[PDB]
Amino acid sequence: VQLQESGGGLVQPGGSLRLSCAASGFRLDYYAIGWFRQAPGKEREGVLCISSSGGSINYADSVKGRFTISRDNAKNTVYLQMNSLKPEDTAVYYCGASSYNTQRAECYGMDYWGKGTQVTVS
Amino acid sequence: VQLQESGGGLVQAGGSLRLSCAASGFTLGYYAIGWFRQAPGKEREEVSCINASGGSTFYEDSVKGRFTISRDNAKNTVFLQMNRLKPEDTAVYYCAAACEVVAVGYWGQGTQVTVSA
Amino acid sequence: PLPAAFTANGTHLQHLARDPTTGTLYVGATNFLFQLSPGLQLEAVVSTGPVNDSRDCLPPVIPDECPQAQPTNNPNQLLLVSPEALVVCGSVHQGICELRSLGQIRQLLLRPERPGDTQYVAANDPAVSTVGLVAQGLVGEPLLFVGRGYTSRGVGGGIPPITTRALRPPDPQAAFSYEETAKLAVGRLSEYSHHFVSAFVRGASAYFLFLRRDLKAPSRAFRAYVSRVCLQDQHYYSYVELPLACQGGRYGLIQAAAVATSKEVARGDVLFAAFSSVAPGTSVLCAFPLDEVDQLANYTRDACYTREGRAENGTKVADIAYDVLSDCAQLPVDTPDAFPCGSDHTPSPMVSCVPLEATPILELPGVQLTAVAVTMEDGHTIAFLGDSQGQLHRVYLGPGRSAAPYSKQSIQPGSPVNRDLTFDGTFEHLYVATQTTLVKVPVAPCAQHLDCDSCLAHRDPYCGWCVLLGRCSRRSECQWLWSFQPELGCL
Ligand SMILES: *[C@@H]1O[C@H](CO)[C@@H](O)[C@H](O)[C@H]1NC(C)=O
Ligand SMILES: *[C@@H]1O[C@H](CO)[C@@H](O)[C@H](O)[C@H]1NC(C)=O
Ligand SMILES: *[C@@H]1O[C@H](CO)[C@@H](O)[C@H](O)[C@H]1NC(C)=O
Ligand SMILES: *[C@H]1O[C@H](CO)[C@@H](O)[C@H](O)[C@H]1NC(C)=O
Ligand SMILES: [Cl-]
């Protein structure tokens, strides 16, 4: 059972970036998926979250209007579209799956995580 | 510890070919032994299967009627007699001490079988 | 007409346990433990998570000692009813357990204050299965047998795959621990890669079904095994394994199993096993008489005790299991009689080289089975089979026909059916669970059919047309015209 993020990089403010999270060893169909980030020296925090059906989405305040999330249950993949990036967005971005209240977009507790991918904004 | 395949080669469509899965330096156990093939650009697939006593044999529908599997305890070898060959039977052929692809944890190098029309 | 279902807002359901005295249902879910009436009405709820934890930290988890801690969900790993308590083990905190009151799950009976590495019971990874059973000791004390798959991304030495643990020891803070030799000693846990499917008690022994890799044979293959150990054997001297296969070795990966359960015989003596080509196509159902299991296990013990694990023709039929440095022996012929569960002079961890083989009683093309339940209605044998797409197949097995899949329904699309298929006390309903849904299915949907022609158009071994009453009904409510093989006609 594995989640693998990919697509990180180094952009300058105003840039865009698209991360992916691919699952292996299980099906994401009945799981909620969230994206988290942890900057050096600070604690991890939720960024975005989607329910199993995709009909419910929740955002952190600092990213509303800029980041979007979408899921593809057949490719076992979830995407995080990051727009209008800012230096405050520099962190390692993690993807996780939850078997808890999956009809909602809570994403408090998590079942599985990925190893993450680094995103740097000049 | 490991089985070795041999007997492959090139023939004409309609000819025969007997394959060999032999135990080098040990006796065949009571496990069922299966034959497999992997055509180029295709996933590995099952072909045949035989238990320890030789009482049970299984053939996939693609080879049922043409192939015959047998186990010789005195020679510590399982043979696959391949009759009425077709160009679609061109593949690398493998044998293992199991009859399902997903149960095998180690594969050998196989034997190449080419069939011209 | 009316149904009954239970859901938790999409929260996954892991395990299900029924109290045979009261009919109360206990449900283990992610971050929850539920107590339900026989009609699936909520009686009580306990929260079991989330918790700040890491599979690298040890309980108690001091937040300042675990800097890699993250909010972790707690899927249930073990849920068993014992005579005087409910046994609950989660995936968090190294798989520690606790006892709670039956009928009052909010009352904690026992949770040791500082568990040691001898009390890490269940698998601490929600993707790895834990199985268990509860039994009695020689003076009636409650014991817990656990089968646990490989996880190691945790701490200490790998927990043994099979252990025997005390539920009421002298010191309550030592509960759930195992004595030093009351376990299966295995070397390369990562390589054998145990995946447990089922566990059950028969006679005076405990049995486990599991997959593991056969490292000594060629091809490094996953195989199906059944194990047996004496309930009172505290050193696992009596341990023995047998490989299981079906259809001449074409099927060797077991997915789920069950014995027949009914009002008549509570636990039958034939093990119905589902095979599929899935590892961690067509499915088959095969039958393994438990007498044949004990017969081969007894022959394996005699051969390794007295003839160096070799048969009269000189053929190797048994050996020492796993990587234990030991050997079969030439003990006196009467050693099995004098020591049926072994001694410190007998070869222990034993494995049979000869497999137990069965023939398929049923084939299901394009279906991947995941759960099995079997019962008997008036001498006829009926199996309820769940698959990986969320469907529930009903099949007539014996004595006749046999290849009789007579019904199929969808419980939840694309969601595997849970192995814990449980019948109510009167075997009138089957509790069926997928990932996020628990449903109370009727075994005999007879009254749905109104006329004789309708009752006979939809053939069902439970159902048949009564003429004394205008009902299509079960046999044991009436002269009765069977829907499956009717004895007459219609008017
Ligand atoms: C589902 O959510 C509702 C609304 O928050 C809540 O009342 C109910 O307890 C939840 N059910 C379960 C089983 O958690
Ligand atoms: C196996 O041996 C035990 C003790 O030696 C005996 O009680 C049991 O009946 C035997 N079972 C079979 C199937 O022979
Ligand atoms: C030798 O005896 C064993 C006894 O179980 C039997 O299984 C085997 O077929 C016999 N012959 C061989 C092939 O060694
Ligand atoms: C849990 O532990 C982590 C790591 O020590 C800490 O960062 C976090 O704030 C804690 N979360 C709680 C107590 O909710
Ligand atoms: Cl072994």
Numbering used by the authors:
A (entry chain E): 2 to 123
B (entry chain D): 2 to 118
C (entry chain F): 23 to 302, 317 to 514, 522 to 534
Q: Which sentences did the original study use to describe this structure?
A:
Plexin-B1 is a receptor for the cell surface semaphorin, Sema4D. pmcThe plexins are a family of cell surface single transmembrane domain receptors for cell surface and soluble semaphorins.
Attempts to obtain a well-diffracting crystal of VHH14 bound to mPlexin-B1 (20–535) were not successful, so a ternary complex of both VHH14 and VHH15 with mPlexin-B1 was pursued. The nanobody also interacts with the N-linked glycan found on N349 through Y31, with the N-acetylglucosamine moiety, and the side chain of Y31 both well defined in the electron density. The interaction surface on VHH14 involves contributions from all three CDR loops, as well as contributions from the N terminus. CDR3 binds into the grove between blades 4 and 5 of the sema domain, with residues A98, A99, E101, V103, and V105, contributing to this section of the interface.
